[PDB]
Every structure is written in C-alpha cells, then in structure tokens.
Symmetry: C4
Subunit: 388 residues, 4 copies
C-alpha cells in the first residue's frame, strides 16, 4: 500500500509472553528438516515468518556432517511459516548466501544475501523477489551483515555491513536503501570501535541497533540511525550489566564510549530495547558460553554507567544451550504502540555437543506484555542421544 512510517513509541514492557517456537531439532529427528543457524523473525503487513540460513541439507542427512562451518556455496536465506520448522517442503529461498538481512517496507520486502570466498564476497540486494543492486567487497575480508531484520521508514531501509578484520578495526558502512537501490552510504562514526551483526528496531522515526564488538568489548555497541536525515551515531551501552559472550563478570560501573575489556576476539549476536526506564537487556546467563538466556530490566542502561537490574525474566535455563538473539517487531499490528519482540537461537550439536557431526538450531521467540506474567523456561528440547 503505502510505505510504513515509525510513528509509534514502544509499549511498556512489564514481562515477556511466548510468541513462537518451532522445536525444529526435536521434530527433525524424524522428518525432513533443513540444517540451519543464524535465524531471526520478520513481519510482512499480513504475516510474520521465521528466517534463517540453511546449510542445504537435512539434519538426518549424511551431508549434515560438517555444518559447523559458517560459509559455503550451499547456504541460502530461507523463510517459512511462524512456529513451523524449516522443512525441505515448506521453506522459501529468499536468496543465496551465507550472511543476510531482510525487512518489509510496507509495500514489499527487501532481502540481502552475501556470498563468495573470504576475499571476494559480494552482496545482492533483492526487492520484490527480484535482484536489484549488487555491492562488491570493499575490504576483501568476509563482507558480512546483520543476521536479523532491518527496519524501514518511508521507503528508506538502513542496513549495517562490516568488511575487514574480526579481531581488529574493520570497515563498517551504513547503507540507506529505498526499493533496493542505494540512496546513500556512510562509514561508521561515533565511539563504537568494532561493529558486527546489528540487531535493530524502530520507534518514533528512529532506528536503534545493538550490535557486537567482536574485537574487544563485552559491553554492546549501539548505533542509532536517523532514516530521514540518513545519519547516525554510535556508542556503547553504559551499564555495568555486560551482555556479550564470553565476557568478564559484571563490574559496578560500565563504559559509555569504549569497549569494556576482559575478552577479545569473540562474541555473540545480541540485542536490547533502550527506552529510558522501559529498558530491557537480553543476555546469556553464562559468562563463558552460549548457555542460558535471560531478559533484565535495566533502566537507562544506554546512558547510565552504574545502572543495575530492577526486574528480570529467565528465558532459557543455564543448563540449556542458547546462541544468537535479535530484535523484530510487528510494525503492522493494531494499537498505539509497537510491541517489542525477540528471538533466541538454540544451538544444538557442534561444538558443544560433539557426539553428532552436525550443527543446527531451533527458535524460541517472545514479545512484551504490559502484564506481569509468570515465567517458564524454553529449551530446544531435543535429546542428542536419539541422533547417535
């Protein structure tokens, strides 16, 4: 119809209710489920779907051996119906590649997949299910993008890309696309020192992205974008409640414009909702690995270097495997506010569960409630032993 505009503010988050869960690994033990990783959720005006990077093989398939690897010629961005597992028969390929992002502008969808060898990758921007623009690697070192949905405002959909080192300074660019065409791009600015896999959402004509500083920060870098002026800023979440992984233990005061030290060259895709007192941070419970997952209300986390939790909700027990997590919202729902949502990737197999030769995941997703709901934990649920 018309391009969607971010006219609403976030709803008050008082708790999180269950939104979707596909139990992919449980089901795929005896059904034709594709091996995946790097999942996310994204809405169209009339439907919300699950997204992920397939590995081009079923879990039970012999070609599942080796899927711990991130980039191959057999990966593709696929989408499928909410809470269903990604099967060979219900998955729709959006594009070919090993890194992606996707978002609906209100009229139609833009999907981006990057493929190629490490020193010669390229991004192909699809719009209305047709290829429209291509961008070649500028740093010739694994051109990569968000791994979760982008956000649009009046046709303009900003996307964050990084090309270059994962263990030192890299070259990050913010591209402003409209109908798949590049309107503008700018190099990253601000105090964020390294940017990867940004998790974004929008409200009141502003897009907020919580990313990953793989190089040095255990606190998470944040990029705020103005889709109209097509400009941005960057900093770190100030709060001493650290949210990357692995990470050092929580201090009493964080860092606003520098990476909090203690762990280098590693991290995990993550997210947060930075809205004054209505601020909630997601993070693995373990400071050592992708284990467990919790939501913590940290009022003014982005700007207050001593902010600590005031409420919380456990999503996955520390005795269960978690993984990537990112933001998305149904910008086409009724009501006066945007309901914050998120997904957590539940990784199974390698490297933590090496009795199997594969690596995959299932998805659990929640959205905010203004009620103060009881909590439950949501594990992947599969028994690795069944796969032996």
């Amino acid at each position: 119809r018309d391009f969607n505009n971010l006219t609403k503010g976030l709803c008050t988050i008082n708790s999180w209710h269950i939104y979707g869960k596909d139990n992919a690994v449980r089901i795929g033990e005896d059904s034709d489920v594709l091996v995946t990783r790097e999942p996310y959720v994204s809405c169209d005006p009339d439907e919300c779907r699950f997204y992920a990077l397939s590995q081009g093989t079923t879990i039970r398939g012999k070609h599942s051996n080796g899927t711990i690897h991130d980039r191959s010629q057999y990966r593709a961005l696929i989408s499928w119906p909410l809470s269903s597992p990604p099967t060979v028969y219900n998955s729709r390929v959006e594009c070919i590649g090993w890194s992606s992002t996707s978002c609906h502008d209100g009229k139609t969808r833009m999907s981006i997949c990057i493929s190629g060898p490490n020193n010669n990758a390229s991004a192909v921007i699809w719009y209305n299910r047709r290829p429209v623009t291509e961008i070649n690697t500028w740093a010739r070192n694994i051109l990569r993008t968000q791994e979760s949905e982008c956000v649009c405002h009046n046709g303009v959909c900003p996307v964050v890309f990084t090309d270059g080192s994962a263990t030192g300074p890299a070259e990050t660019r913010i591209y402003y696309f409209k109908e798949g065409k590049i309107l503008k791009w700018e190099p990253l600015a601000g105090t964020a020192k390294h940017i990867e896999e940004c998790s974004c959402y929008g409200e009141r004509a502003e897009i907020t992205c919580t990313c990953r500083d793989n190089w040095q920060g255990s606190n998470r870098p944040v990029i705020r974008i103005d889709p109209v002026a097509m400009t941005h800023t960057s900093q770190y979440i100030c709060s001493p409640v650290l949210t990357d992984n692995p990470r050092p233990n929580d201090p009493t005061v964080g860092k606003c414009n520098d990476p909090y030290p203690g762990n280098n060259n590693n991290g995990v895709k993550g997210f947060s909702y930075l809205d004054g007192v209505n601020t909630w941070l997601g993070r693995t419970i373990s400071i050592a690995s992708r284990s467990g997952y919790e939501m913590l209300k940290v009022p003014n986390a982005l700007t207050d270097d001593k902010s600590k939790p005031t409420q919380g909700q456990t999503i996955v027990l520390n005795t269960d495997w978690s993984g990537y997590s990112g933001s998305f919202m149904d910008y086409w729902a009724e009501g006066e506010c945007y309901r914050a949502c998120f997904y957590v990737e539940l990784i199974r197999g390698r490297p933590k569960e090496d009795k199997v030769w594969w690596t995959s995941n299932s998805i659990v997703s929640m959205c905010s409630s203004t009620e103060f709901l009881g909590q439950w934990d949501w594990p992947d649920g599969a028994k690795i032993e069944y796969f032996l």
Copy 2:
C-alpha cells in the same frame, strides 16, 4: 465482513452422518505425522479445519517417547485441512501452549493458548494471527481452558477458564472478548460445583456449554451464556443418563443442581445438544474407561431428572478406544438452521496400549441429518503391533 450473529435455531437431529476422519495414527505409521491430543474442529466463513495440541514430534520419532504427559514446552495449538492428518508439512501453528480454544467471529479468528509451569501459567489471546491480550494465572494451579471451539455473537466471544484444584473447588471465570480484548469477566455462578473443558455451541443468541466436573459429578455441568448481557447461569444435566467417564451405572433419576456421586477426581471432556425434545447426549459406552462412544436422544435431558433415551446411534464400538469429544458447528453454512456437529478423539497408545511409549490420537467427526440414516462404527483403525 460483518460479525456473525447466532440468529438460527438448531436443525432437527434425526441421526448423524460422517463429516470428517483423518486416520492420523494409521497414516502416521509411515509418514511425518505429529503426535497430538485434545483435538477439536472449528469453521471459518470459508473453510472448516481440524485443530489439536501437538506434542512437537512425529509419532515414529524417537521424541514420541513420553507424550503421555499433558504440559510441556513443546506443545502448540495447530490447525490443518479437514480430514487430512496433522503432518509436519501441513500443520499451521496458531499459538504456543498446552491448553487452548479458538473461534472465528465472522471477521477474523481468535485463538488462545496457555503455557507455563503449573504455578505460573499465563494465557495469550491472539486475534487476526497477532497477540493482543495476556492473562496471568489467578489461582497459580494449572490455568486451563476449553480444548474445543469457543462461540461468538456480534464480535463477543465468551471463553470459560478454570484455575485451581482438579479435585476440589476451583476458580472458574467467564471472559467476554471482542477482537481479542477483554470486555468483561465474571466468576462462575449457579449450581455447577466444578468446571473444566467446556464444549460449547450457539443458537438464537444464546451459548450453551457442556463441561466436566472433575471433582465429583458423573452427570455433566452446563453453563448457558448470554453474549449480549454478558451474563450466565450454571446447573447440571438433570437426566439419569450419566455422560462423564468413569462413572457409576445409570440410575432412574438424576440430579439437576448437584454432582451425581459415585466417582471423584476424574472425568473426560464431553458435550451435548440441549434443545427440548431435540436433545442428544454423547458419551463413552464404557462406564470404566475411554472406550466406545454413542449418541443418545434424551428429550429434555437438561431439565427432566427421569429422562431416558428414545433413539440412539453408536459412533465407536465398545471394543475400540475413544476419548475427548466436543461440539462445533459451521455457522456460515446455508439454510435456515445450524447443523449440530461433534468430534470424538480416538486415543491410541498410553496408558491403555503400553506396548508403545507414546500417546496420540486420530479424529472422527459427524454432523446431524434430518434423515434417519443407517449407522456404522468408526474406529481409529491402526494396528499397534505395527508400531512395535
């Protein structure tokens, strides 16, 4: 289009004709069929579908071991095409949870799923495939609902919930929703002493629900709701023809305002059509277990404590397993009256058939005919031995 109004009365039931059957267990012996239980049927203005609570695994899958349990993080309400089995590839998830209800108001559908641990469950009310309202447990003891379709009148769709004990008094509430929002709720009133899993239908601007008194009654409690005044009453079916299970033998006189004694703390979801002489009761043939199923015409059953059968129709032989049963009607069919329909859940596996480690079911469904049709019996049809 416009909200549906219950303007018609029930058609004269002179017999029951076969409506749908999915032979799920038979087929799933060698195909990717999801393990389920607590099924029902529900119509949209242009299509009628099968519904159930998946267990998040296929029957042949190794994760089928243990599906005798009712509440887990791997269950979800799914719907699929009429008479097809619930497969991994054709099932649509309506919401995540282990207790549900769903109904179309004429414009769009409302689905409700409850999830969580026993002392901290919550209901999420979906409307137009989007989450709209959430209700937290009020008694912190397995918040639960109908397990069959709700009914709407001019946008207002009442739903019966129970929170609290299954073996003593509990807290039942009737919620009046419109477009997924709570218009009002009231505590249960009348003479029904315990309410669970209500089976409802509507005609002439009135909704009738036949429920389950798990605590003491072998006769079935009945809740009649006025969707306009948003008020209700409750009593028991007076007739000495008892319809819960397990149950004592049939007496010569029933009880109108108290549970008929003889069996405590147990029961089965069931239903009835209470329409003067056009009254028909469904029930298992066995008074000991979920075995067999029959329809009995008992004129004035609700109000006559000595009413006995005048006609009948066998649905499932006493030598075959039955289970839950509930009401639904296609409120969007042609004609001058609403054709009463019902489904019977045919449970296979545990606990009755313990040679297998799973528990599932298939569905058989019938609707009324004004003709006096010959009868047949409709078993699930699978051979457990094939699964050994």
Copy 3:
C-alpha cells in the same frame, strides 16, 4: 460465476494425445503416497485435478496390507493436482466414504461419498465443501455410485446410483441435484437390465453415460439423460465390439436391448463416446482380465449391431495391467467444441500381483486430438520386485 450449460458438441476425435500421468506407484516406492483405487479426473473452471478413493495408508506403510478390500471406515474421496501422485501432504479430502462421484456446476463443486456397512449405507451430498443432503440406503445392499465425474447443465447435476444385488436385478435411481439439493429422482427405465458405475459426459444439452451391467452383459448399458426435462432412457451399445471385462470373444452382431451373454456376475467400470461416426470405444485388450487398454473408433456403435472398428489406438499393452476407465471433459476450455478425455486406472498388487499384500494404482489420462497422432503405450511403470 454462472451455471455451465452444455452448449457445445464433441470435437472430432482423430486420435488421442497424452494429458496426465502421475506414476504414483513408481514414486510411492520411496515417498509418502497414499494407497488408492477407483480414480477419475474432474475439472473446475480454473483447474483440473485427479480424484480417487484413498485407503487411508501409504503404500510402503504396514497398514497397506489388506487394501484389496473395497469398503472400510478408512477410505475417503481425495483430490490432488493434475499428474502429481496422491501424497499424504498434497491430497485434499472431499468427503468420507467408499464410493463416490463429483462435478463442478460452473459456480461450485458437488461431491458425493457413500459410507456404512453393506446393509445400512448412506450417501452424503456435499456442495461448496459443506454437507447439504443425505440419502439412506433403499435396498440395504451396498448403496453405490459412479466412481467418476457427474455432469451438470444449468445447475442440474444428474447422478446414477444403484442399491441391491450385483448378480441379479437391483434398484437403480437417477437423482437430479441442484446446489446439493434433490430436485427429483426416478427409477431406472429402458432396456438396460443392470446398472453400475456409470461413466458420463455432456454435449448439446444431453448427458450420456456408459455403465457396467455386472449381472449379465458383456456389451455396455447406456443411459442418456435430459437434464432439463430431467428424464432419461437406457439401452445397450448395439455393436458386436464388446467392451466389458471379462467377456466372450467378439461376435459379428451385438445386442441393442439386452445383455450380450457369456459372462455373468462380473465386469469393470468403463466408458465410450457415442457420437455418430465420431464414436470411440475404450476396452481392455484381454477378454479375461484387466490387462491392456485400447481405444477403437466404431462408427454408430450405439445403434448399429454389426458396427466394427475403422481406426484404433493402443493405450496400454496387453502385457501391462489396466483397470477402471471413465470419461471427463474440461467444460471450461476455449474453442467451439468439447474435447473428449478419459483416464485408465493402472492397478498394481493384488490380486494379480500377490507377492505384495497391498492393492493400489496409478493414473494415465488422454484427450482427443483432431490430428492423427503417433501412438505410444503408457504402463504404470513400477517394478513390483522393488516392493519385496
């Protein structure tokens, strides 16, 4: 839109071209294909589909053992996309039963399924995917119908039913339905002595049905119906070219108003296009069993008791299994005439191939061409040994 009217005459049949083939048995050797029998083809204004009576199990499934039986509680009329096999995941159930017919009136479709025990069966007439009318057995001996499509003219869709003996006189009725409601019914009249499984088609406001005289005739009975006057006549195909099976050898002169003797109490569903010189008869090559299949042009076959073939086309070699065959046409195609089409059921398994415990089939279908096309033979193609 509007009800379809049979305003065109048949196109000149100079040969037959391949229309559809699903290779169901070949494919189902390693995929979830439903066991079926009694197939046919039928068109909607915008799509043509395959139809059949499922046995409620896959071919590879253990429940396939025993599918040689015709009537069970696990059968249903299903339809699926043209030339695809009937799989668990792509088959749509039209109704529950072990005998059926179906046809589109131009506005919507009417489907009829008969179910029940031999002495108490009933037909349920569905229209617009909703049950509308029910007809109870009148002779209490396997109420049964066409097993191929019916035909409509201005909303009126006649259907031929038989109730009673298969080895002596029975009670045949012609029902005239409009929107699933019975407008009228009449007992069979004319000289046909026994009627079963009629194969019908329409042109120039007249419906012609070629049926099966199971009792005594090896020539085929014919019922011509006037859908406007709602009246009919019946006789036998006069031609000495006999088309039932099993059957005696071809004589030099046939019988117009009596069954041609030689074989009693047996037969096979078959068809023909009776259009003056443009007359073509279908039949098995073997006079002993459902083996092979051929089309023979027999000018004036219906009215000329000495008519012999003038052209022919082999469809299935006598070294391959055939089975039922019937007529259908796409009444919604472009052009000035109706293109005659037909299907042949290719039965595999029992009783001819008893190394397997099942019985199923695949479908081959052709339509007429005004060209004189080269011919090929179209076997089912599966290797029974693969199933051992």
Copy 4:
C-alpha cells in the same frame, strides 16, 4: 494483462551475481527429491521458477536405477519454486513428455511437451494449463525441442523444433504460436547445418537463439528470429573461442557460416548473449567432457572470426561436473534494460559417476551485474559416496 513486448535492450554485463541454487542432489540424499535432467528457469510476471524433466522417481528410490536414459513414459515437465529442490510434494507437472520448452507471454503461459516412441512422437502445446494444439512427428526420428524457455513478443512465441538425424542433416522448423495456436511455421534457413536445443532470449523486438550442432560444429549455430515478420536467419558464432563440448582446442580464427570441425555427432546444450562489445559466451572448461563452466566476454563474437576473450568469470571449477546451460530473463523486472541470466545443469551420477545406478542433477543460476563482482565457484556439492 497485456502481451509483453521486447522493448528493452540488454543491460551491460560487467560480471555475474548468484541468482538461484537448489542443491537438489545434496538435499535429496535424505528427502523426497525427484530425479531430473534437462533443467531451465523461466519467469511469469509475478514469479520465477525452476523447470526440468522429471524421471518419475525419487533419487533414493529404487526406480532411480536406469535414469541415465533420456526418453521414457515416466518423464514429465515439472516446475517448482525458485531455489527449492524439485520434490514429490512441491513439483507441479506442466505436461507429460521427454522434451520440452515453456514461456509466459505476459498474459499466460505456454508449455510444450513431446512424447512417444522414436518413430512416432508428437508435441502437445498447452496454453493456460489446457491442451490446445498437437503436432505429429514429420521426420519420425525423435521429434525434439529446446529444453529451455521460449520467448514471446506481442503474443507471438517462436519455438525451434528438430525432427530427424542427430548425426547428419535433420528437419528443423520454427513454429510461431499465439495463444497455443500455430500462426505459421517455416523450415530452418541460413547457414546453420544442424540445429538442436536452442537457448533463446529477447531484446529490442528480436529473439536470439544459440543452439547445438550435434552433427559437426564445435562452434555454436545461432538463429535470430523476427517475431513480428515471423522470419529468421541462421549462422554460426564466428569467434575462434569454441563453446560446444566435446570440442577441439581453440584456434585463432573461427568459422561464420560452417561448423568448425574436429568433433562429430555430439555436443551439449549451451547459450550466449550476442550484443556487440557486451557479448558473453558460456562454455565448459574441459574440451573433453561436461566438466567445469565459465563465462567469457568476447566482444563481437558472432561476427568477428578472430575475437578472443577480454574478461571472464569462472562459474564451476574444472574439477566439478557441469552439463546443460541455457538463457532466460525476467522480462517483467523494473528498470530500463533486460538483465541477462543463465543456468548450468550440474549432472551427478551416470555416466561419469557410475558407482550409483542413477543420473540426476542440481541447478545453479546467475544474472548479470553492472558492477565488477568478485567470483566464487558453485559446485553441486553432493558426496556420491553417501549414496553408496
């Protein structure tokens, strides 16, 4: 809507970006994927799909033994969603046969399948999913067609057919169809000596086809068609860069009006984009077998007998199997020019990999970019050993 007209010229090809890949063989190792060969890609105004000739069996199925054969009664043209594999459950049969072509005219699609024994084959032309015209073999020696999409201009869709010898002169005809009806046909003219499997595309009201001279040429014959005058010409690509296979080594000067000698009675379906300096040729890297695949920019290749490459892009390494390749374009995309695309069939199994008894393939497809993108190689990716 309206018939599409070839009003645009080709976009400047500066490189090729990944468009689609189904990894069919990898996935089909453990899922119900149909055995195929002779694939292609073709767009409708609102969707682009993969096409191929199924062998009527799954890869893992026992009936896969023998699929090295090209013509059987079990083959059919099927289409399925872009980048998905051709599965039993997602494949749509367009028609029955062992040779085909298909194209959308802007209003609807025309599909053509040829079937029959070698000396009696026939083509059936389908339009709007209905059979419309039939053409009988004129040379009674394997009537055959393109094996890739045809192209339309204002309703007129030319198709190239060949009937007769594959090792000597044959009878090639160009048919001009409009709405499935034959408007005209002409015998091949010009200097091309043998024509097979033409790969076509259109721009500026002209259709260019790069075909295969199976008889003597290692250079490729070219047919240019005027869809308005309904006339054509034929010649060979002049360039010394030879593109058939097997083939002799590249000389320094090619042949414009005669087959370049060195290899007789063999070849492979291939293609090219002949657009002045914007000319690109596709070809296997190996001169001995269907191994590897590369794109080479050869300015003025069609008319310059000494033209050599100026740029190139590897598509498949010479250490991986390739096969057929052809052209297609999305004539319904936005923009001022038509983006050239192509697919490469990646054959697996027999005859090169004879450890398995089957022959199949997967598909890789690319489209042009005006950017100068980095390249990667795209193998089928399956491990034959897994199939042993």
